[PDB]
Amino acid sequence: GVAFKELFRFADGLDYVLMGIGSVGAFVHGCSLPLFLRFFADLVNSFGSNSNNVEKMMEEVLKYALYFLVVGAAIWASSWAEISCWMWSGERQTTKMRIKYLEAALNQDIQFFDTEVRTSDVVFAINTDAVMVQDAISEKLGNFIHYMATFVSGFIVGFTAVWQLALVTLAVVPLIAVIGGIHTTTLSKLSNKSQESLSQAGNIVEQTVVQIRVVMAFVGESRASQAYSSALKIAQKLGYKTGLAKGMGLGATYFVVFCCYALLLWYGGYLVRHHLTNGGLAIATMFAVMIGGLALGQSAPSMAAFAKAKVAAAKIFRIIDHKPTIERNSESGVELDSVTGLVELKNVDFSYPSRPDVKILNNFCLSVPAGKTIALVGSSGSGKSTVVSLIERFYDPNSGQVLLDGQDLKTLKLRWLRQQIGLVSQEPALFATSIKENILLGRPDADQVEIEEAARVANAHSFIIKLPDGFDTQVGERGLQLSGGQKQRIAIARAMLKNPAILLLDQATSALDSESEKLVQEALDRFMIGRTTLIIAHRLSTIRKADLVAVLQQGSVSEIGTHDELFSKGENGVYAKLIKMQEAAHETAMSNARKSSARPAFKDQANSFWRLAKMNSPEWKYALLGSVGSVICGSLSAFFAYVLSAVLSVYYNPDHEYMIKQIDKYCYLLIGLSSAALVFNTLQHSFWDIVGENLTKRVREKMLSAVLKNEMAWFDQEENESARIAARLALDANNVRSAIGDRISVIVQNTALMLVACTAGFVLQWRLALVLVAVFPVVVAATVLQKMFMTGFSGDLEAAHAKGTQLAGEAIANVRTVAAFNSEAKIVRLYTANLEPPLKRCFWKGQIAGSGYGVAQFCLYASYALGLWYASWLVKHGISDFSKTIRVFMVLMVSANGAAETLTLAPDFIKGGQAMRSVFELLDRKTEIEPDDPDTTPVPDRLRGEVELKHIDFSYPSRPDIQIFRDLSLRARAGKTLALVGPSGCGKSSVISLIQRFYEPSSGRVMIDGKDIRKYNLKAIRKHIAIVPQEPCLFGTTIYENIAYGHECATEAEIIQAATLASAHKFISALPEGYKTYVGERGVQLSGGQKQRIAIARALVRKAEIMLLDQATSALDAESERSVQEALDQACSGRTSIVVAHRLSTIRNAHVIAVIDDGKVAEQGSHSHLLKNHPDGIYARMIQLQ
Ligand SMILES: CC(C)[C@H](C)[C@@H](O)[C@H](O)[C@@H](C)[C@H]1CC[C@H]2[C@@H]3COC(=O)[C@H]4C[C@H](O)[C@H](O)C[C@]4(C)[C@H]3CC[C@]12C
Ligand SMILES: Nc1ncnc2c1ncn2[C@@H]1O[C@H](COP(=O)(O)OP(=O)(O)OP(=O)(O)O)[C@@H](O)[C@H]1O
Ligand SMILES: Nc1ncnc2c1ncn2[C@@H]1O[C@H](COP(=O)(O)OP(=O)(O)OP(=O)(O)O)[C@@H](O)[C@H]1O
């Protein structure tokens, strides 16, 4: 909360012009609809009280039908200057704010991102705070002068027209506005209890799409639809009451509005027959208070955005001003002439200023000679990037002088000092630009010639030519998503252009494949010529090429020697322990880097309006009562325009005895047809939600029941991942609710007006009811634009500014890399030119949408001055009179307003969603493997378990390049063991994926008991085969269910004995709730070793003859692994087993051990066989490894 009138601090001379015009021109538009009614009261009062002198009919009406065109045409230059000088004065005060919010955050030291505000929010606050400030300069101030103009002019064309009918009307507007306040709140209670329950029943599909490999493995793909049904039966009983609370919520408006014109239109009839008030002045005074009375009601939402503005701007002015203390522009600095790379650190102690007690650096002493290959290889977790983060002078040391040619870092100029030092971190940084721009961030003023040879030295120039756009390829969201080595070599070239004198490299090839890390070292050795070089490395090749090696120890330099002297010490020194931490990062890198790859016209609406509304036919008895209630509220929207009209004819009758009677009908009917509005308005909106929701639940339970029939190969395809399936069941399920439900209640009750409004037109006077019906399109159009107003034109500016935000998103997040260069003037000048095409676009939407509301409020107030011109032309030529003509006119205009307050009450159909394409694509995709196929040979009794593979070839449809299996055959015998091993990670699990029929082999037969797996019912053949997954994640339920999720039915004693045989029952007996303990992702997270025990407890319940054990290791307990295997000795009692593991002691007693090699078996035998008959193979060497 800064204040008001400090938001406008970026203002200049010209923005004090666009707010003068945006205020006065928004004041003329406010004082119009009051000063239109008094040209309407004075018209009818003169048109209707001269029924004997026809000469004072022409020059009276034609005078006031030229005060409508002026009131018309003065809403060109008062609504093409309000809407088009605030939405352009909120683009010269927000856009100049986002520039200074990036000139004063990237120009701020790193410690500001540590002890002040997080880096998670300063990337957030440029997106969410710099929009809700912009909505309080432009729109919600322009919609606030406009109301106080209507409000004050609501009470001066009011209280001086008629005294005593203004005081009564002002005692009514409370009774309306306090009921419209009940209507807006009690919906918002259910609007946040309903969708919260949908987020409860929205992750129940997320606990199946993520774990699809276990759900489709077992039979239970139906029983995880049985929860998603019953978790939405809650979401109807929070949806049925939404209609019944909106049904009475409109009913208590049409009860008060009718029963407050039973008074104001009686008390008007008391005034005329005591000679105080005419007939124009008693319908004008009645409206001009009920215009200005309710126009104060929308002055609160424009006020509420002046509360969130002044506080969400206060988070931005914290960073704008914010004096630093480190001397970046230190023009009282010194300069050198010839550096040599002489770097020394003496008695340096340093830790972070976030935990000011640690001793990360403790008397650090490094001596770097000029032009060497010195390497800092110490223990992990001992800094090992903070040491790099001081030679750059990110921070400042607590105590100790950092020497550079015998000079301190607190002497030179940082703008000049950072130019000599090149730097490559572990992960590089490339911004959403082209290629040459991401190269010129090192040095600005190089030509094209110096760039092209340098990237060729870095071995990047080859595939840049292979790119289609060359060096103008837009790297970022587009740019065909270059690989990590390709991202690496550009940043290597980004330092080569700079020509540094000192080199700093921290884990260059730590995340690169064996192909490109050779290619990097081909470029590094070219770049390490004659330069002072400090490399923290990852492999021995740099260590062998290292000149001098220093060894850290707990924040202290321990060993200072060479590559050979530290190697000659043997295991006496720490250099042998450096090997112990070396290849721990070698093999775990590209195994896990593989895991990143292994884990990854009107005929369009022809039947989609009809096939959709054909499965919506067990409920026709609830949509032929809500159509009855849509006609009755169709009449009462137009019957009210008749009573208000025909009273206005009674006021000009000189018989004060027909006037007491013929008011006393139109007051008693107005109460008698007020009680039959509230009763028949909770049938129009209540029964069009019981037809509403019971379609929507019937669609959500067919989509998930038809996603789970697609093959496993369908499910990892490009768009079918986890976060994109729940979107197709959240957007497509709710956007299809508003297509059959709303647009029968709207299309009918905007026809029940026309049979009652135009009937009064084509009975009383058949000639006036053509000209009004010909101009009847432009009236109902012009009321929609008065209702698209008050929500503001040009909404949702996230889409117009999502491209420019991405450059500020990556720049703040890379604040060490950006400040490692002097690239803090280009990220300013490139944040500019991502705004200049979305700045001119917001301009020309001002000059178009300003006039598109400008004309359509002139064609309304002109078509009133042509309707009421054809009134006096009939009276002058004796074809009609006053009583029939003004009874026609006000019916056809007040009903015309009542039409347009239907289209903006049930919105979102006029291409509100074309999502009907996305639904029927998903319900009607055809599979190739039917998971429950009728007419198939059944499963026999409890079989011997003959697993056998014959001449099998495989290829994933995601990557059909590499063939996995090349004429592979393998046979499990009648129930002993077929334990398999192999090299190169747990990708070997793609043998189990062939048995489960998750995929299809390229050639061969998958025969079981001499019978193919295409000759069984697929759920029936997935009955007898258990499977332990690799990394078990669990369901957000009880442990008692996750073990009961292993059979069709479940009994108590079967769960208890099996978990005891699983040997997890002990600590389960020591848990707080034990079996009924709530686990998953919403409660107690467990250990990975106990996650293994639950998964093994799952598989034992199946009593499966065939069993497929994946990696049962990484249960870090030598006691438990032996004891579980003792039970696993009994877990194969007459059972066929494939056991796939790592440690050879598990397969020590295995019958048939085989090795995967090049799509073929390598060796066949066991422990006593392959060490006897083929002792020179792979099976003997890995025993010495373990
Ligand atoms: C026949 C026309 C010449 C007419 C006078 C016209 O100028 C005027 O703009 C009409 C369309 C408006 C002006 C005031 C409006 C009313 C504003 O005050 C009312 O009585 C409110 C009460 C309540 O808010 C209703 O939902 C709308 C309702 C009932 C409006 C119905 C239509 C109007 C009567
Ligand atoms: N503000 C901070 N920024 C970074 N590290 C911090 C900070 N405060 C404390 N630290 C500690 O500094 C340590 C630096 O990490 P570590 O010593 O494991 O090597 P590293 O810097 O991560 O090496 P690399 O970046 O090459 O992986 C962290 O373990 C962290 O606990
Ligand atoms: N879930 C998956 N979907 C599609 N393709 C995959 C999947 N997992 C892995 N792959 C592909 O298979 C390749 C290697 O995984 P695979 O399962 O073939 O291991 P493997 O060759 O059997 O390993 P091993 O050396 O242990 O025999 C990867 O390059 C990857 O592209």
DSSP for 607-674, please give it: STTTTTTTSS-S-STTTSSTTHHHHHHHHHHHHHHHHHHHHHHHTT-S-TTHHHHHHHHHHHHHHHHH
Is 332 labelled a binding residue?
A: no
Question: At 690, which amino acid appears?
Answer: I
Q: How far is the CA of 53 from the centre of ligand 2 (A)?
A: 98
For 75-88, give the secondary structure using H, E and C.
CCCCCCCCCCCCCC
Q: Which of 168, 290, 644, 768 to mutate to test the pocket of ligand 1 (most atoms within 8 A of CB)?
A: 290
Sort strands 402-404 and 343-350 into parallel, antiparallel or unpaired.
antiparallel
Is 261 labelled a binding residue?
A: yes
Q: How far is the CA of 987 from the centre of ligand 3 (A)?
A: 5
CA dist 1172 → 884, 1048, 1175 (Å)? 117, 47, 6
Q: How far is the CA of 628 from the centre of ligand 2 (A)?
A: 71
DSSP state letters, 561-589: EEHHHHHHTTTSSSHHHHHHTTTHHHHHH
CA distance 650 to 658: 9
For residue 640, the ligand 1 atom closest to its alpha carbon is 29
CA distance 288 to 841: 39
Nearest to residue 751, comparing CAs of 895, 889, 652, 649? 895
Q: What angle, rounded to 10 degrees, do the helices at 869-876 and 55-64 form? A: 170
CA distance 1144 to 1140: 11
Nearest to residue 348, comparing CAs of 370, 364, 329? 364
Cβ(555) – ligand 2 distance below 6 Å: no
Q: Which of 385, 510, 581 to mutate to test the pocket of ligand 2 (most atoms within 8 A of CB)?
A: 385
Ligand nearest to the CA of 360: 2
For residue 294, the ligand 1 atom closest to its alpha carbon is 24
Ligand nearest to the CA of 901: 1
Q: How far is the CA of 1000 from the centre of ligand 3 (A)?
A: 15
Q: What is the CA radius of gyration of the chain?
A: 40
Give backbone dihedrals phi and psi of 180, rounded to 5 degrees, phi first. Answer: -65, -20
Q: Which two tokens stand for residue 8?
A: 């406008």
Question: At 1177, which amino acid appears?
Answer: G
For 884, other C-beta atoms within 10 Å of its C-beta total 15
CA distance 182 to 480: 54
**Neighbour-count burial of 883, counting CB atoms closer than 10 A to its CB (0-12 exposed, 13-18 middle, 19+ buried):** middle
Pocket of ligand 3 (CB under 6 A): 597-598, 716, 956, 958-959, 964, 982-985, 987-988, 990, 1156
Is 541 labelled a binding residue?
A: no
Fold of 430-499: Rossmann fold (3.40.50)
Is 385 labelled a binding residue?
A: yes
Sort strands 965-971 and 947-954 into parallel, antiparallel or unpaired.
antiparallel
CA distance 206 to 212: 10
Q: Which two tokens stand for residue 962?
A: 């590499």
CA distance 746 to 753: 11
Q: How far is the CA of 998 from the centre of ligand 3 (A)?
A: 14
DSSP state letters, 140-173: HHHHHHHHHHHHHTTTTSSTTT-STTHHHHTTTH
Strand, coil or helix: what is 362? strand
> 């938001």: which residue's tokens?
7
Cβ neighbours for 967, distance < 8 A, ≥ 6 positions apart: 951, 952, 953, 1159, 1160
> 């991405």: which residue's tokens?
806
DSSP state letters, 1094-1119: HHHHHHHTT--SEEEE--------HH
CA distance 965 to 222: 34
Pocket of ligand 1 (CB under 6 A): 40, 257, 287, 290-291, 294, 890, 893-894, 897
CA distance 728 to 981: 41
Is 323 labelled a binding residue?
A: no
**CA triple 286-291-296, angle to 5 deg:** 135
For 978-990+1023-1185, CATH number? Answer: 3.40.50.300
CA dist 167 → 38, 151, 257, 291, 616 (Å)? 18, 16, 17, 15, 53
Sign of CA dihedral 1054, 1059, 1061, 1065: negative
CA distance 785 to 763: 31
Q: Which two tokens stand for residue 1001?
A: 């082999």
- Where do runs of H (alpha helix) occur along 404-505? 414-417, 435-439, 448-457, 461-466, 484-496
Residue 603: DSSP 8-state: S
**CA triple 4-7-8, angle to 5 deg:** 110
Q: How far is the CA of 515 from the centre of ligand 3 (A)?
A: 19
Give backbone dihedrals phi and psi of 118, rounded to 5 degrees, phi first. Answer: -60, 160
For 1058, other C-beta atoms within 10 Å of its C-beta total 21
Cβ 646 vs Cβ 887: under 8 Å: yes
For 391-418, give the secondary structure using H, E and C.
HCCCCCCCECCEEECCCCCCCECHHHHC
Residue 1157: DSSP 8-state: E
User: Which residue CA neighbors atom 16 of ligand 3 most closely?
Assistant: 987
Q: Which two tokens stand for residue 825?
A: 């003037």
For residue 964, the ligand 3 atom closest to its alpha carbon is 18
Cβ 577 vs Cβ 553: under 8 Å: no
Residue 964: DSSP 8-state: -
DSSP state letters, 781-841: HHHHHHHHTTS-SS--TTGGGHHHHHHHHHHHHTHHHHHHTT-SSHHHHHHHTTTSHHHHH
User: Which residue CA neighbors atom 6 of ligand 2 most closely?
Assistant: 352
**CA triple 441-446-450, angle to 5 deg:** 105
What's the number of CA atoms in the CB half-sphere (13 Å) around residue 427?
Answer: 3
Is 987 labelled a binding residue?
A: yes
**CA triple 1101-1107-1108, angle to 5 deg:** 120
CA distance 313 to 6: 10
Cβ neighbours for 979, distance < 8 A, ≥ 6 positions apart: 1137, 1138, 1139, 1140, 1141, 1146, 1147, 1150, 1151, 1152, 1153
Nearest to residue 859, comparing CAs of 796, 785, 798, 792? 785
CA distance 820 to 424: 10
Cβ 504 vs Cβ 534: under 8 Å: yes
**CA triple 928-933-937, angle to 5 deg:** 120
Nearest to residue 920, comparing CAs of 1168, 699, 1172, 1072? 699
For residue 383, the ligand 2 atom closest to its alpha carbon is 17
Positions of chain breaks in the chain, given as the residue before each break (C to N > 2.5 Å): 600
> 């029941």: which residue's tokens?
705
Is 751 labelled a binding residue?
A: no
Q: How far is the CA of 712 from the centre of ligand 3 (A)?
A: 15
CA distance 740 to 626: 13
Q: How far is the CA of 135 from the centre of ligand 3 (A)?
A: 52
> 């090299």: which residue's tokens?
983
Q: How far is the CA of 274 from the centre of ligand 1 (A)?
A: 27
User: Which residue CA neighbors atom 14 of ligand 2 most closely?
Assistant: 383
Is 988 labelled a binding residue?
A: yes
Q: Which two tokens stand for residue 251?
A: 């009913």
Cβ 341 vs Cβ 501: under 8 Å: yes
Strand, coil or helix: what is 729? coil
Q: How far is the CA of 361 from the centre of ligand 2 (A)?
A: 12
CATH 3.40.50.300 boundaries in the chain: 331-420+501-600, 430-499, 978-990+1023-1185
The span from the first CA to the last CA of the chain, in angstroms, equals: 66
Nearest to residue 107, comparing CAs of 254, 297, 307, 326? 326
Q: Which of 67, 889, 897 to mutate to test the pocket of ligand 1 (most atoms within 8 A of CB)?
A: 897
For 331-420+501-600, CATH number? Answer: 3.40.50.300
Sort strands 532-536 and 373-376 into parallel, antiparallel or unpaired.
parallel
CA dist 670 → 633, 635, 755, 839 (Å)? 14, 13, 20, 54
Question: At 332, which amino acid appears?
Answer: S
Sort strands 502-506 and 421-424 into parallel, antiparallel or unpaired.
parallel
In this structure, the chain runs to a length of 1186
Cβ 1025 vs Cβ 1107: under 8 Å: yes
**Neighbour-count burial of 21, counting CB atoms closer than 10 A to its CB (0-12 exposed, 13-18 middle, 19+ buried):** middle
User: Which residue CA neighbors atom 8 of ligand 1 most closely?
Assistant: 894
Q: Identify the helix (H) or strand (E) that includes residue 758.
A: helix 754-764
Cβ 408 vs Cβ 402: under 8 Å: yes
Is 989 labelled a binding residue?
A: yes
Nearest to residue 722, comparing CAs of 196, 211, 224, 1083? 211
CA distance 150 to 345: 75
| Letter string b/e over residues 620-653, b meaning 16 or more CB atoms within 10 A of that residue's CB | eebbebbbebbbbbbbbbbbbbbbbbbbbbbbbe
Cβ 204 vs Cβ 231: under 8 Å: yes
| Letter string b/e over residues 222-261, b meaning 16 or more CB atoms within 10 A of that residue's CB | eebbeebeeebeebbebbebbbebbbbbbbbbbbbbbebb
Cβ 284 vs Cβ 38: under 8 Å: yes
Experimental technique of record = cryo-EM
Cβ neighbours for 220, distance < 8 A, ≥ 6 positions apart: 1045
Give backbone dihedrals phi and psi of 547, rounded to 5 degrees, phi first. Answer: -85, -60
* Resolution given for this structure, in angstroms: 3.8
Strand, coil or helix: what is 549? strand
Ligand nearest to the CA of 68: 1
For residue 897, the ligand 1 atom closest to its alpha carbon is 11
Nearest to residue 701, comparing CAs of 205, 1059, 1124, 1150? 205
Q: How far is the CA of 1005 from the centre of ligand 3 (A)?
A: 21
**CA triple 587-575-511, angle to 5 deg:** 30
Ligand nearest to the CA of 297: 1
CA 88 to chain centre: 28
For 503-548, give the secondary structure using H, E and C.
EEEECCCCCCCHHHHHHHHHHHHHHCCCCEEEEECCCHHHHHCCCE
User: Which residue CA neighbors atom 20 of ligand 3 most closely?
Assistant: 987
Is 16 labelled a binding residue?
A: no
CA dihedral 564, 570, 574, 578 (to 10 degrees): 70
For 157, other C-beta atoms within 10 Å of its C-beta total 23
CA distance 863 to 869: 10
Is 863 labelled a binding residue?
A: no
CA distance 1111 to 354: 42
> 């490559």: which residue's tokens?
424
User: Which residue CA neighbors atom 24 of ligand 3 most closely?
Assistant: 988
**CA triple 325-107-381, angle to 5 deg:** 80
Cβ(114) – ligand 2 distance below 6 Å: yes
